[PDB]
Design an enzyme around this catalytic site. Structure first.
Site, PDB file in Angstrom:
ATOM      1  N   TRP B 137       0.846  -1.191   0.000  1.00 28.80           N
ATOM      2  CA  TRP B 137       0.000   0.000   0.000  1.00 28.80           C
ATOM      3  C   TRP B 137       0.888   1.250   0.000  1.00 28.80           C
ATOM      4  O   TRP B 137       1.768   1.371   0.865  1.00 28.80           O
ATOM      5  CB  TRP B 137      -0.930  -0.039   1.216  1.00 28.80           C
ATOM      6  CG  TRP B 137      -1.893   1.117   1.336  1.00 28.80           C
ATOM      7  CD1 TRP B 137      -2.050   1.942   2.420  1.00 28.80           C
ATOM      8  CD2 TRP B 137      -2.837   1.576   0.345  1.00 28.80           C
ATOM      9  NE1 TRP B 137      -3.025   2.881   2.165  1.00 28.80           N
ATOM     10  CE2 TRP B 137      -3.521   2.680   0.900  1.00 28.80           C
ATOM     11  CE3 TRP B 137      -3.171   1.158  -0.954  1.00 28.80           C
ATOM     12  CZ2 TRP B 137      -4.516   3.375   0.198  1.00 28.80           C
ATOM     13  CZ3 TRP B 137      -4.155   1.851  -1.648  1.00 28.80           C
ATOM     14  CH2 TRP B 137      -4.816   2.945  -1.069  1.00 28.80           C
ATOM     15  N   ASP B 218       0.510  -5.564  10.076  1.00 35.97           N
ATOM     16  CA  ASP B 218      -0.678  -4.844   9.640  1.00 35.97           C
ATOM     17  C   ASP B 218      -1.760  -5.885   9.377  1.00 35.97           C
ATOM     18  O   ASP B 218      -1.559  -6.801   8.567  1.00 35.97           O
ATOM     19  CB  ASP B 218      -0.378  -4.024   8.382  1.00 35.97           C
ATOM     20  CG  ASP B 218      -1.415  -2.938   8.121  1.00 35.97           C
ATOM     21  OD1 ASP B 218      -2.629  -3.236   8.144  1.00 35.97           O
ATOM     22  OD2 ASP B 218      -1.015  -1.775   7.892  1.00 35.97           O
ATOM     23  N   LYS B 254     -12.837  -2.833   6.604  1.00 34.39           N
ATOM     24  CA  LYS B 254     -13.424  -3.817   5.702  1.00 34.39           C
ATOM     25  C   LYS B 254     -14.218  -4.889   6.445  1.00 34.39           C
ATOM     26  O   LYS B 254     -15.326  -5.229   6.018  1.00 34.39           O
ATOM     27  CB  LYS B 254     -12.347  -4.491   4.839  1.00 34.39           C
ATOM     28  CG  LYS B 254     -11.238  -3.572   4.329  1.00 34.39           C
ATOM     29  CD  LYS B 254     -11.666  -2.727   3.177  1.00 34.39           C
ATOM     30  CE  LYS B 254     -10.482  -2.083   2.422  1.00 34.39           C
ATOM     31  NZ  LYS B 254     -10.037  -0.742   2.912  1.00 34.39           N
TER      32      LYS B 254
END
Lengths: 409, 408
Positions: B137, B218, B254
């Site tokens: 990312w 993460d 999400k």
């Protein structure tokens, strides 16, 4: 700890947090927490504004309601409406596309945005320091110092006269290096409650412009202070007349009671649309690398109120409710101190505005109030007026009267 | 401008934003947004999870509901339950008071917190660089660079095998200076979608341990990826066995569909309660001087789900719904490319997991897909499966087939 973290020194106890611990351990039924930094009603309870509850019900039933990401700068009908309510006498700033508005994690996040931007794009090459009031909200100092800016102060509380130290502030403005940054409270100064008069403001603006200082307004209590939105934004709109670009950090935490939903906005008021867009693009870089995008829930509620004429009018009624109760508690406290003939003058209690008040009590007097009347508030004499209500205001007046009579300075 | 601000150069637009602007201007009726950064249902629409809709009604109808400030570190019932759901196989971490947990402004804010703390209390004493996957990312690089840490990469995407570059990553772990910082993806690697297998993870952990690297995980897709919360956090919990303190950045964007409410948590898994409390007190200083305190609405929803056995079971059904739909779209796309005999191998489409996939398409093939088939996705070949559904997946397969056949 395999990485050296056991060598860290554990940080000192937060000021408000340690007072709250002591309040909670006190077993006396008459205890009062006068350090609460949020509005409370006449029963001492959190108070959801009827217009805000109504708006959240309307929003949740809307067909388009969802939890999807906002744009990086936030919900457009919020950021536009937030700017409009600040600048109702100056709508041309919006329609000329001169305001760069970034929805922020409430007022603190707006201050973080402005300070990060100003440090990178102004302080780096000018070496300017930032000037904050003495006293002020303590995060004003640490937030700027953590970003690498040197923090100076200007005098604000005149303790002998229990008033605004106009001459000391003015003198600091004139002697500070040209192009210093000045962090100004738009209204309802935190923590003292005492604001410059309009006459004093005009002289303050004159000297700020003569020294070419950069102005950042913090406006956390618009409408909440007086019940009148345009009155509380008067200083902002007066400064617009001078045609200098400046910054505004805006919170809806208190005036809409949105505290924990973290609804705020940072604004840069550009001289032209071109610079507005340059600055906005850089503010988005900061936002992207800290939070990515801001929380939606409070912004939808605020936008619903601000863009609805009827909800807006009902919100103004809620502002009147809150500001009137604080004013009434200030009057009750002052009237009882006068009736008890407490030594000293007590008109500063009703000349101040907003939910914080510098009472003028000394640390010995504050400690006396804590031990003998179980009142919990800051050693500098700051109280939150929101903690006062009909069930305790006479107890508080009696404590102050006793403390001042017993322990003159 | 009276202050030099007119001399600033306007930053150029983010590539994702510019792509979406192009998608919405396209008038072709067969256009597909393959860059949607959030879950979409089988009809292409945003999808509120039934359990979240139920949880938010429960929260707001509670008698004591209000909008008051949370503590600096966030809502205690949320931060405790956020750690619990990560470490269900290891409840001793919470009972021994070893986890310092800070509610954050979703996963980005959790990363900012972790990076600010590590720069201040680790990097400035050691000089360590942080190593991120190539690719990753893009905010991972800029977030850490803005805080003053030098950013290195470890290999991740094997373009020729269309798989995880295990030997390249392992080689970089072994050759990086001792005590470097490694940012790992717990599951559903963003943007490739390809994860290490369990046996590859074990070897990755051994080399990280032998070079005494500091590990930051993460975890943005727990449960969302496979429908199985404990399977998606397996790598986190396996690392607990190695008895090294480490960091976790967690997002509920999400897996609860809470995207814009900004609900996440940063965790430091200490060796003991003393250091946990030292780190936590320093994390609060960072938080106090950036946001003051975190947003309550999404955290209240999450805490309602995570602390109720019945709502939790409902949420697990929603996790199965989302993960199953993404798996099915991957299967549909893969099966059509196989049936179309598109040159190359396409099993990576179904070996990847999560919402994002490296397709293996070249920049010229991606551009071909945009101009001839009106498919909008990144030039590195990354797609989001969220925009795929029954109405367009065959159109997408035929586009890829044509692009690969025409531009070998």
């Amino acid at each position: 700890s395999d990485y050296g973290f056991a060598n860290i020194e554990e940080a000192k106890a937060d000021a408000i947090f340690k007072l709250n611990a002591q309040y909670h351990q006190d077993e006396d039924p008459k205890k009062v927490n006068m350090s609460v930094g949020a509005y409370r009603d006449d029963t001492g309870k959190p108070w959801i504004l009827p217009a805000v509850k109504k708006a959240s019900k309307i929003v949740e039933e809307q067909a388009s309601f969802n939890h999807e990401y906002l744009p990086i700068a936030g919900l457009p009908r919020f950021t536009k409406a937030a700017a409009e309510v600040l600048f109702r006498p100056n709508p041309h700033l919006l329609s000329e596309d001169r305001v760069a508005s970034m929805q922020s994690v409430s007022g603190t996040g707006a201050n973080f945005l402005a300070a990060s931007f100003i440090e990178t794009f102004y302080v780096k090459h000018t070496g300017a320091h930032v000037y904050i009031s003495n006293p002020t909200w303590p995060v004003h100092r640490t937030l700027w110092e953590k970003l690498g800016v040197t923090v100076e102060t200007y005098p604000y509380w005149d303790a002998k006269n229990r008033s605004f130290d106009y001459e000391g502030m003015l003198s600091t403005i004139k002697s500070a290096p040209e192009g210093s940054i000045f962090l100004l409270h738009a209204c309802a100064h935190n923590p003292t409650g005492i604001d410059p008069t309009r006459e004093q403001w005009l002289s303050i603006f004159e000297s700020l412009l003569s020294r070419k200082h950069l102005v950042v307004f913090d406006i956390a209590y618009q409408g909440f202070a007086s019940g009148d939105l345009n009155r509380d934004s008067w200083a902002l709109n007066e400064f617009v007349k001078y045609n200098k670009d400046f910054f505004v950090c805006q919170s809806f935490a208190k005036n809409m009671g949105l505290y924990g939903e973290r609804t705020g906005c940072m604004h840069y008021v550009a001289k032209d649309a071109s610079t507005k867009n340059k600055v906005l693009s850089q503010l988005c870089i900061v936002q992207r690398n800290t939070i990515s995008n801001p929380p939606a829930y409070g912004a939808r509620i605020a936008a619903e109120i601000l863009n609805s004429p009827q909800l807006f009018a009902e919100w103004e009624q809620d502002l009147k409710t809150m500001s009137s109760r604080i004013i009434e508690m200030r009057k009750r406290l002052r009237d009882s101190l006068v009736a008890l003939k407490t030594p000293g003058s007590w008109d500063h209690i009703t000349q101040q505005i907003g939910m914080f008040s510098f009472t003028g009590l000394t640390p010995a007097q504050v400690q006396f109030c804590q031990e003998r009347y179980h009142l919990y508030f800051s050693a500098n004499g700051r109280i939150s007026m929101a903690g006062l209500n009909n069930s305790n205001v006479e107890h508080v007046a009696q404590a102050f009267n006793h403390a001042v009579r017993e322990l003159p300075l």
